Design a protein around this ligand. Structure first.
Ligand code: HEA
Ligand SMILES: CCCCC/C=C\C/C=C\C/C=C\C/C=C\CCCC(=O)O[C@H](COC(=O)CCCCCCCCCCCCCCCCC)COP(=O)(O)OCCN
Ligand SMILES: CCCCC/C=C/C/C=C/CCCCCCCC(=O)O[C@H](COC(=O)CCCCCCCCCCCCCCC)COP(=O)(O)OCC[N+](C)(C)C
Ligand SMILES: CCCCCC/C=C\CCCCCCCCCC(=O)O[C@H](COC(=O)CCCCCCCCCCCCCCC)COP(=O)(O)OC[C@@H](O)CO
Ligand SMILES: CCCCCCCCCCO[C@@H]1O[C@H](CO)[C@@H](O[C@H]2O[C@H](CO)[C@@H](O)[C@H](O)[C@H]2O)[C@H](O)[C@H]1O
Ligand code: CUA
Ligand SMILES: [Cu+2]
Ligand SMILES: [Mg+2]
Ligand code: NA
Ligand SMILES: [Zn+2]
Lengths: 98, 43, 227, 105, 144, 46, 73, 58, 84, 79, 49, 259, 514
């Protein structure tokens, strides 16, 4: 009616697919599939922006449903603010030798 | 926008040469065909 | 016919063409006025150093931008569609004439009573008689009775053509295998000219139409003499 | 939104924040000049005193130039605003763009 | 001072009457006397000279408003050069008439046109407004 | 990798402006001349 | 000396827009009045005056005498 | 049949810098050269056929 | 319809195999019978050289130019009628 | 009723610009009529209206080709 | 310091305008172009028949 | 090193060889129709076939062997296949429009009737109904294959996919036999034109769909599919349902209603 | 390395550059064909030959300008360079298939130039109507080569449309909804849906024409019960969506250019602009028989197509008034791209308004197949699609190349082109109202004055096209490298520098949900 013989993804996925599947099982998102959830964005509680290099582009949708996104480079160091709404972001570099 | 000064400035005389060559590149071959249309038409 | 430096339509020879001219005047003013209004705001938006660059609320002004155009379109479409259904109204023709397009000339058949038909070709420029019009005269004109509603049926024996007479507001495509009908009524005697209006090959520019509108009794004797 | 007085009072308060930082001074002025208005003297006074707390003389001068610029062809507005600010200009030692020759093309 | 292509991702200076306080100072590196001037700026501004005040402005910004908004003579070059090249176009048209186009048809000869004009009036071309309406059939001349 | 930056992200060289002028004259001039030579060809056949 | 008066400082772009969108409309109404008058009304009256006493047989006889027709000499 | 996908995964992930369409080895180069030769040779032949067809024949 | 069969619960290979062998392949076997019954030799109609049929505006690019691609001599006349 | 035939009148069955089926239908009606009349001994003069109408509307080449096809036995309408 | 427009702008405007008018008037009037203007108020009609 | 989930594809010669194969096929058809020669056309068909084979081979290398089809890449390929099928639906709609235009207003040349005078349609209850049962049955078996694969059952996936292909081949052999048996041809006016061009393009798509199912069959034999990742199979199934639906519209429109 | 990079590309910027170079070369072919048309018509009589060589030139003029210059530049060139950058994506969804959409175009253009070289060319009109395009009135290979050119261009664009739709739906940052994508990305998504649905119907129609010409089908031949008018419906069911495909990416570039040089962070009324483009795309599929008002359709069909064609003015008007509302209050920067966009707003509005005249079928009886239609569509194409292309090319040339143009020469170029195109096309309205037909190699003498002026205008536009080539040469010859660009917070495609590296967004942007 039924038997086996078909590999599973656990058995046979490879390469990036396998990395994404193993990371997800750990609740981790090294390949940026999910949208990060904002913090309150104050200077004490900045949005923490991970990166593998010294700077990353941020898009800030300052209020819900704005159609305009405000884009800027966030660099390693002191938190920076969105130039439209002032909400704070801080770069958290490093790894993928992760 | 802002930009650096030219790395290889094109002086007025060089612009006149590039502009003349560019216009002749379009005008001479077409001008040659149209000048000779009667030649192509009456055999 | 058209005359040199002409800007608008040929004067109307039929009441339908008159209606089209007034409907065009109505529409063109609107075209004027909108094109002028646009250019004038444009120029108002571009001629002040005052600024306001923060986010602007769109909803109120979009109501005006949709509703006033919609009203303008209804003010064009109402007279437009009155004319369309007027031209389609039943009228009772007194005569039917067919024209067949060919490469490159028209034939005409008037077979209500007798089997009258003939071909109509452009007069070559080197054979024009003095005073005749280059590319527009034909050897055998389409003689027709003035002040009478005539049914013209149009078809083709080869590729598409299109039978047009601008001063009567007429253009009906000539399609092989199809018989298209239009109505013609000239308010005046005279010579009314048109030109083939669908690309049809090497001499598309050189197969014109010339209607000759005369009193019925002259049309009758002409018809008899053409048998 | 609010009355004109409430709008003005929110901006006066923004600039009067004692420990306003340089980023906030710039954000405030670059936001304010997006509006359809020339800021009232009392807003400009509070921005000029924020420049003083931030030891930034040049930005005080630039704010006076952007008041003139926002008035467009209404050439009566800037002299009126400089008139109303004269006590604060004298108290803080702020020279106007014209006194500095910075109105010359 | 000098801006570099490899600085493209860093905050940059801009003279924009709509963005009066840009994100960085026009000059960040200071000489010994420029450092001393920024220290003096911490004290009362009434003690700064007019030249010190202008120096502080030109460290912070590049051009003033009057300078960045100045008008220019560029319109004369644009309109003059566009007229030149439109004039150059008429040389091409002169060349095409001379070497490309042959004679136009004989229906444009003056006598043909006078006869054709009479025949258009005899068949009352455009008699309501366009053409024959402009002829006076009673006086046998063009309407004044 | 491949070259990056101004003048290097294009399939033609801009290292010499006169060799460039020649290449641009050949490229845009051949497109503009083609229809005249096709007309010449259609006239010369019949 | 005299102090200067306080001028209006707010809404100057909106005020200018208000004033001119009105002038643009008032003008569209004035141009429509000239347009009806100089082109459309003029046409109607040219056609009505042409046909009011028009005699199509007299027009035909004129044309016929001028030699323009194939079917009528 | 036996599942030999792991062997192919090791082959195609070998760190040899080869693009994927030549990574299976020498037979890929051969098939690529055949395909590209027939395409380029056919394209020249098509141009020849245009030259021929562009003129009337006796 | 619900059609006339009836089962669900969250879905399955066993059911789709049951539909393939118990409904789909039987229907093909029945239609294959029905077609077998009505197969072979119908009686070709008189040839009539109708002008809307057997169109030839350009010869076909194979054969002698006058035969259609899957020409069946028994039932496809040429423009001049059935072949020998 | 109708002598002083001038042309084919308006026919509510064919009120649109495409009048091809008006021509075809009258040609069929005429010839169907004439076959019925020539058969049953009666008079083709009764078919006259269809004859005038199709002669008025139909292009001469369409009538000529349909007549050749009726003679050839390849006319595809039912008469 | 004066740029290209301050130094050459007046002469480009004057010379381009002068040149443009001169060559278009010459082209329009001196080389045999047939503009075919209206006969109205221009042509004396002549017997044709 | 990227930190998004998308696939940066290695530079490839197949787009160019595919474009050239299209130049060779079309200039080849022009040579065949006008200059009596098949040479360019067979060179183009051969290079089109080589291109298709190496390009899809490389997509299998990239996915099954190299792991670049993360879920975000697979979701793209889902949308791509759906959009491709929609374009093919609109291509068939043009032929359906032509069929209904000519059959709803049959011209005098046809006899003013549909089917035209002189046309003797096939009986839709004979081989056409058989073909309908065949493609419907194959949509049932292709669904059994899909559920077997999701349930991890190799033998029954292969058995059901082989049945599906066998029925695709049955329909194609039955259609070829019907084309040879039919007493009307593509030259038999607009009836033959609509009939053979609309069913002929449908037959080509049944051949393309069957080839795609055979590719999936050999990949399944080589264990490429997992019980959760097998988009080639899904795409071939969606294409196969499209070929069945188009057939049902042809059967109702041309064979049944147009008889 | 050169062959791997430029013939085997899988990179959206380099493929975009290939499309812009192809489109520029096609634009010179199409300009030369446009000058041969106006040389034939610039004095009365015959210059070249009869209407066959003339209408081979007119036919090729249209196909070159539409399929080899506008579509490759707007969708293949600006779409590929800008869409992935505007959404932070690392490339297109199918970067290898994207390169085949590009490489199908040289062969499609080769087929079209072969059609003109063999026999007597395809002198059919770009509509390719039968029976003039059938195998009795156009015997021999020319029209088949044209059909095959169109099949290759159609496959290229259908596969491009699948690529763009998939990329725009699937490859945005996970926080970005489709209501946070820029207007030019929406304009390319909607154009791609129009291409996906319309091109297959043209492919069906031209394939039917190919089988009537070569396999003895009779879809359009009444002798077999076919109908020439069925081809017209199938052609124009694609042909009306095609003109909205030509202009929509233009509208997306105009929205960016107007917003940028008004010093605004956003266009006025963004959701109205999305609604207007979706409405114009939807209505553009239900109006096609406005190209057929003289073929003999019933009066009620003619009433419905008049009304439905006019309705498109409502959403089109919303976009025009919203570009004026975006200028309102702007800090206006009179750059040469802004001049192009302002020329576009006014000249597109004139041509849309003469489109509304033509929508009235009773007036279209007299205007159809005359130069009034030629004037309508050249104000929306030569003064709308071309001016959006030139605005986007001068705005984004420093992004693509890293070098700046000379803005004074670019303004001179805009001035000459604006005079030229208006001299060329404005008098064609008078020629159309007074009755001059389309597709004529010569005209009755009365039409001479306006044809002479229109031809003089066309030479002014030729001077502008020549100068454009010199201006591009001068920028590459001087190499003034870009330093800072304004407004990058609301123009993401600039934020990677000029030109951006070969791989961008290898680390995607960070966008939170909030
Ligand atoms: C980019 C190309 C383009 C575009 C955008 C358009 C837009 C439109 N066109 Fe055009 N058209 C063509 C290219 C284009 N056209 C071409 C190439 C042909 C000829 C095909 C051939 O035969 O070869 C053609 C032909 C064509 C015809 C057939 C004419 C005939 O052959 O007899 C018609 C008929 O309706 C038509 C109408 C319209 C209309 C109503 C629009 C509308 O979409 C325009 C809407 C825009 C506006 C109306 C302006 C902005 C609005 C405002 C400022 C609001 C206020 C306005 C109002 C109240 C009205 N066009
Ligand atoms: C089981 C069905 C599969 C078909 C097998 C036959 C071979 C052709 C393959 C492709 C089929 C597709 C349709 C193409 C058009 C015509 C073929 C129609 C189907 C067919 O095979 O029709 C046959 C005729 O074929 C003829 O003329 C044949 C002429 C063969 C040349 C084909 C022409 C080239 C086609 C151009 C295609 C253009 C592609 C468009 C791409 C669109 C881009 C977006 C019918 O035979 P008959 O003897 O007339 O009548 C039966 C009498 N006993
Ligand atoms: C064929 C049909 C043609 C139809 C044409 C019809 C044209 C419509 C006319 C528009 C008038 C209605 C809008 C009036 C505003 C004008 C611009 C302006 O006025 O700039 C500002 C208004 O903008 C605000 O806020 C509100 C939000 C921003 C402004 C919204 C402006 C609308 C855009 C104007 C569009 C111009 C282009 C029109 C195109 C035809 C003025 O600021 P306020 O004093 O209000 O606030 C200041 C805040 N305080 C009071 C708290 C201190
Ligand atoms: C008669 C000959 C002339 C006509 C030419 C066509 C001939 C036959 C072609 C048959 C089509 C074969 C397509 C084979 C595709 C194999 C590649 C494939 O299926 O690739 C899959 C991706 O899908 C993909 O790209 C999906 C790719 C699908 C595209 C194919 C659909 C048909 C294209 C046909 C051309 C249509 C012509 C239309 C004519 C008008 C790979 O991903 P998975 O399967 O998830 O595997 C990974 C797992 O192993 C990980 O665990
Ligand atoms: C629509 C696009 C083109 C529009 C306008 C072109 C403007 C013309 C540029 C000049 O073209 C040249 O003109 C010469 C004449 O001035 C031609 O020489 C011809 O005439 C000379 C003088 O008679 C002889 O010396 C030459 O041998 C003979 O080739 C020459 O061949 C042709 O290249
Ligand atoms: Cu007959 Cu054009
Ligand atoms: Cu349209
Ligand atoms: Mg037409
Ligand atoms: Na001419
Ligand atoms: Zn923000």
């Amino acid at each position: 009616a039924s038997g086996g013989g078909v590999p599973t993804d656990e058995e046979q996925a490879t390469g990036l697919e396998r990395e994404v599947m193993l990371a997800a099982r750990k609740g981790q998102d090294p390949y940026n599939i999910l949208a990060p959830k904002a913090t309150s964005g104050t200077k004490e509680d900045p949005n923490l922006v991970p990166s593998i290099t010294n700077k990353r582009i941020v898009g800030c949708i300052c209020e819900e449903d704005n159609s305009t996104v405000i884009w800027f480079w966030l660099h390693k160091g002191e938190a920076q603010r969105c130039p439209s709404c002032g909400t704070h972001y801080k770069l958290v570099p490093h790894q993928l030798a992760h | 926008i802002t930009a650096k000064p030219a790395k290889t400035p094109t002086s007025p005389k060089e612009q006149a040469i590039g502009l003349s060559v560019t216009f002749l590149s379009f005008l001479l071959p077409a001008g040659w065909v149209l000048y000779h249309l009667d030649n192509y038409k009456k055999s | 016919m058209a005359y040199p430096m002409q800007l608008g339509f040929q004067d109307a020879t039929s009441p339908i063409m008159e209606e089209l001219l007034h409907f065009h005047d109505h529409t063109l003013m609107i075209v004027f006025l909108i094109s002028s209004l646009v250019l004038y705001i444009i120029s108002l938006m571009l001629t002040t150093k005052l600024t306001h660059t923060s986010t602007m609320d769109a909803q109120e002004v979009e109501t005006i931008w949709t509703i006033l155009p919609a009203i303008i379109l209804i003010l064009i479409a109402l007279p437009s569609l009155r004319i369309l259904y007027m031209m389609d109204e039943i009228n009772n023709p007194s005569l039917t004439v067919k024209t067949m397009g060919h490469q490159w000339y028209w034939s005409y058949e008037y077979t209500d009573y007798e089997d009258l038909s003939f071909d109509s070709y452009m007069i070559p420029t080197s054979e024009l008689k003095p005073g005749e019009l280059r590319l527009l005269e034909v050897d055998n004109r389409v003689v027709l009775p003035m002040e009478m509603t005539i049914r013209m049926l149009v078809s083709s024996e080869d590729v598409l053509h299109s039978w047009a007479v601008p001063s009567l507001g007429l253009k009906t495509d000539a399609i092989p295998g199809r018989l298209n009908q239009t109505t013609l009524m000239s308010s005046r005697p005279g010579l009314y000219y048109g030109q083939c209006s669908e690309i049809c090959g090497s001499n598309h520019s050189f197969m014109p139409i010339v209607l000759e509108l005369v009193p019925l009794k002259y049309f009758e004797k002409w018809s008899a003499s053409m048998l | 939104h609010e009355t004109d007085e409430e709008f003005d009072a929110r901006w006066v308060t923004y600039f009067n924040k004692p420990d306003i930082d340089a980023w906030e001074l710039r954000k405030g002025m670059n936001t304010l000049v997006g509006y359809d208005l020339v800021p009232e003297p009392k807003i400009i006074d509070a921005a000029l005193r924020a420049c003083r707390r931030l030891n930034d003389f040049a930005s005080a001068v630039r704010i006076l130039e952007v008041v003139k610029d926002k008035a467009g062809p209404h050439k009566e507005i800037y002299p009126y605003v400089i008139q109303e600010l004269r006590p604060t200009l004298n108290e803080l030692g702020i020279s106007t763009p014209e006194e500095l020759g910075l109105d010359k093309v | 001072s000098v801006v570099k292509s490899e600085d493209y991702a860093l905050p940059s200076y801009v003279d924009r009457r709509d963005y009066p306080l840009p994100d960085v100072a026009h000059v960040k590196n200071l000489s010994a006397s420029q450092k001393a001037l920024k220290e003096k700026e911490k004290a009362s501004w009434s003690s700064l000279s007019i030249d010190e005040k202008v120096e502080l402005y030109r460290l912070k910004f590049k051009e003033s408003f009057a300078e960045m908004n100045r008008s220019t003579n560029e319109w004369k070059t644009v309109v003059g050069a566009a007229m030149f090249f439109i004039g150059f176009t008429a040389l091409l048209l002169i060349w095409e008439k001379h070497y490309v186009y042959g004679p136009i048809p004989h229906t444009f000869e003056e006598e043909w046109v006078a006869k054709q004009t009479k025949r258009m009036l005899d068949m009352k071309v455009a008699p309501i407004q366009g053409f024959s309406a402009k002829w006076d059939y009673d006086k046998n001349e063009w309407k004044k | 990798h491949y070259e990056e930056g101004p003048g290097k992200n294009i399939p033609f060289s801009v290292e010499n402006k006169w060799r460039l002028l020649a290449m641009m004259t050949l490229f845009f001039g051949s497109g503009f001349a083609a229809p005249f030579f096709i007309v010449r060809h259609q006239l010369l056949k019949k | 000396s005299t102090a200067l008066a306080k001028p209006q400082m707010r809404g100057l772009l909106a005020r200018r827009l208000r004033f001119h969108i009105v002038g643009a409309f008032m003008v569209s109404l004035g141009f429509a009045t000239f347009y009806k008058f100089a082109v459309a009304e003029k046409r109607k009256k040219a056609y009505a005056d042409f046909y009011r006493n028009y005699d199509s047989m007299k027009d035909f006889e004129e044309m016929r005498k001028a030699g323009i027709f194939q079917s009528a000499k | 049949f036996e599942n030999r996908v792991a062997e192919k995964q090791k082959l195609f992930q070998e760190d040899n810098g080869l693009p994927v369409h030549l990574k299976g080895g020498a037979t890929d180069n051969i098939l690529y050269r055949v395909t590209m030769t027939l395409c380029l040779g056919g394209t020249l032949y098509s141009l020849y056929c245009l030259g021929w067809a562009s003129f009337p024949h006796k | 319809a619900s059609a006339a069969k009836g089962d669900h619960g969250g879905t399955g290979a066993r059911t789709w195999r049951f539909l393939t062998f118990g409904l789909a392949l039987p229907s093909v076997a029945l239609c294959t019978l029905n077609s077998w019954l009505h197969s072979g030799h119908r009686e070709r109609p008189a040839f009539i050289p109708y002008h809307h049929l057997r169109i030839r505006t350009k010869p076909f690019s194979w054969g002698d130019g006058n035969h259609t691609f899957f020409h069946n001599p028994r039932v496809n006349p040429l423009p001049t009628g059935y072949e020998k | 009723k109708i002598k002083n035939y001038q042309t084919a009148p308006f026919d509510s069955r064919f009120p649109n610009q495409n009048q091809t089926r008006n021509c075809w239908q009258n040609y069929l009606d005429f010839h169907r009529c004439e076959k019925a009349m020539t058969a049953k001994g009666g008079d083709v003069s009764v078919c006259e209206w269809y004859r005038r109408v199709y002669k008025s509307l139909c292009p001469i080449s369409w009538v000529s080709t349909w007549d050749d096809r009726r003679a050839e036995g390849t006319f595809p309408g039912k008469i | 310091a004066p740029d290209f427009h301050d130094k050459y702008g007046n002469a480009v405007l004057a010379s381009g305008a002068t040149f443009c008018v001169a060559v278009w008037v010459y082209m329009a009037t001196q080389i045999g172009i047939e503009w075919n203007p209206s006969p109205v108020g221009r042509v004396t009609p002549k017997e044709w028949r | 090193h990227q930190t998004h989930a998308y696939h940066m594809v290695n530079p490839s010669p197949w787009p160019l060889t595919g474009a050239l194969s299209a130049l060779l096929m079309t200039s080849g058809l022009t040579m065949w129709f006008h200059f009596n020669s098949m040479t360019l056309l067979m060179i183009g068909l051969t290079t089109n076939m080589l291109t298709m084979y190496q390009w899809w081979r490389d997509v299998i290398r990239e996915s099954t062997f190299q792991g670049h089809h993360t879920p975000a890449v697979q979701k793209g390929l889902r949308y791509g296949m759906i959009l491709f099928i929609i374009s093919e639906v609109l291509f068939f709609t043009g032929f359906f429009w032509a069929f209904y235009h000519s059959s709803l207003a049959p011209t005098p040349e046809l006899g003013g009737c549909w089917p035209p005078t002189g046309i003797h349609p096939l009986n839709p209850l004979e081989v056409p109904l058989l073909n309908t049962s065949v493609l419907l049955a194959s949509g049932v078996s292709i669904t059994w294959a899909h559920h077997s694969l999701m349930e991890g059952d190799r033998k029954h996936m292969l058995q059901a996919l082989f049945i599906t292909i066998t029925l695709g081949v049955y329909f194609t052999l039955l259609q070829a036999s019907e084309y040879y048996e039919a007493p009307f041809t593509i030259s038999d006016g607009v009836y033959g034109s609509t009939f053979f061009v609309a069913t002929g393009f449908h037959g080509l798509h049944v051949i393309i769909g069957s080839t795609f199912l055979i590719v999936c069959f050999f990949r399944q034999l080589k264990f490429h599919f997992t019980s959760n990742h097998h988009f080639g199979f899904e795409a071939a199934a969606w294409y196969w349902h499209f070929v069945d639906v188009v057939w049902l519209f042809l059967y109702v429109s041309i064979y049944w209603w147009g008889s | 390395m050169f062959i791997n990079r430029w013939l085997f590309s899988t990179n959206h910027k380099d493929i975009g550059t290939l499309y812009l170079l192809f489109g520029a070369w096609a634009g010179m072919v199409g300009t030369a064909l446009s000058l041969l048309i106006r040389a034939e018509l610039g004095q009365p009589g015959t210059l070249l030959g009869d209407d066959q060589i003339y209408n081979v030139v007119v036919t090729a003029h249209a196909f070159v300008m539409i399929f080899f210059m506008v579509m490759p530049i707007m969708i293949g060139g600006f779409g590929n360079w800008l869409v992935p950058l505007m959404i932070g994506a690392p490339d297109m969804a199918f970067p290898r298939m994207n390169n085949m959409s590009f490489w199908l175009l040289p062969p499609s253009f080769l087929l079209l130039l072969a059609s003109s070289m063999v026999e007597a060319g395809a002198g059919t009109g770009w509509t390719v109507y039968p029976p003039l395009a059938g195998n009795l009135a156009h015997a021999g290979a020319s029209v088949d080569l044209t059909i095959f050119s169109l099949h290759l261009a159609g496959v290229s664009s259908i596969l491009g449309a699948i690529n763009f739709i998939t990329t725009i739906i699937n490859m945005k940052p996970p926080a970005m909804s489709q209501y946070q994508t820029p207007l030019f990305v929406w304009s390319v998504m909607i154009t791609a849906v129009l291409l996906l649905l319309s091109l297959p119907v043209l492919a069906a129609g031209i394939t039917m024409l190919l089988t009537d010409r070569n396999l003895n089908t009779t879809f359009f031949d009444p002798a077999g019960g076919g109908d020439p008018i069925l081809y017209q419906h199938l052609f124009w069911f694609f042909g009306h969506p095609e003109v909205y495909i030509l202009i929509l990416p233009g509208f997306g570039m105009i929205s960016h250019i107007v917003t940028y040089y008004s010093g605004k962070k956003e266009p006025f009324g963004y959701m109205g602009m999305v609604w207007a483009m979706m409405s114009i795309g939807f209505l553009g599929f239900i109006v096609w028989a406005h190209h057929m008002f003289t073929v003999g359709m019933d009066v009620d069909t003619r009433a419905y197509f008049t009304s439905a064609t006019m309705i498109i003015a409502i959403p089109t008007g919303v976009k025009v008034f919203s570009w004026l509302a975006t200028l309102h209050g702007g800090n206006i920067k009179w750059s040469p791209a802004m001049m192009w966009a302002l020329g576009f707003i006014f000249l597109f509005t004139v041509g849309g308004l003469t489109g509304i005249v033509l929508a009235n079928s009773s007036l279209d009886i007299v205007l159809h197949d005359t130069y009034y239609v030629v004037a309508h569509f050249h104000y929306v194409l030569s003064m709308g699609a071309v001016f959006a292309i030139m605005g986007g090319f001068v705005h984004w040339f420093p992004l693509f190349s890293g070098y700046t143009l000379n803005d004074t020469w670019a303004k001179i170029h805009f001035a000459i082109m604006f005079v030229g195109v208006n001299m060329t096309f404005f008098p064609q309205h008078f020629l159309g109202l007074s009755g001059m037909p389309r597709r004529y190699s010569d005209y009755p003498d009365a039409y001479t004055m306006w044809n002479t002026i229109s031809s003089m205008g066309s030479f002014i536009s030729l001077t502008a096209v020549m100068l454009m080539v010199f201006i591009i040469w001068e920028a590459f010859a001087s190499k003034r490298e870009v330093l800072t660009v304004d407004l990058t917070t609301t123009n993401l495609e600039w934020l990677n520098g000029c030109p951006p590296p070969y791989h961008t967004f290898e680390e995607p942007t960070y966008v939170n949900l909030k």
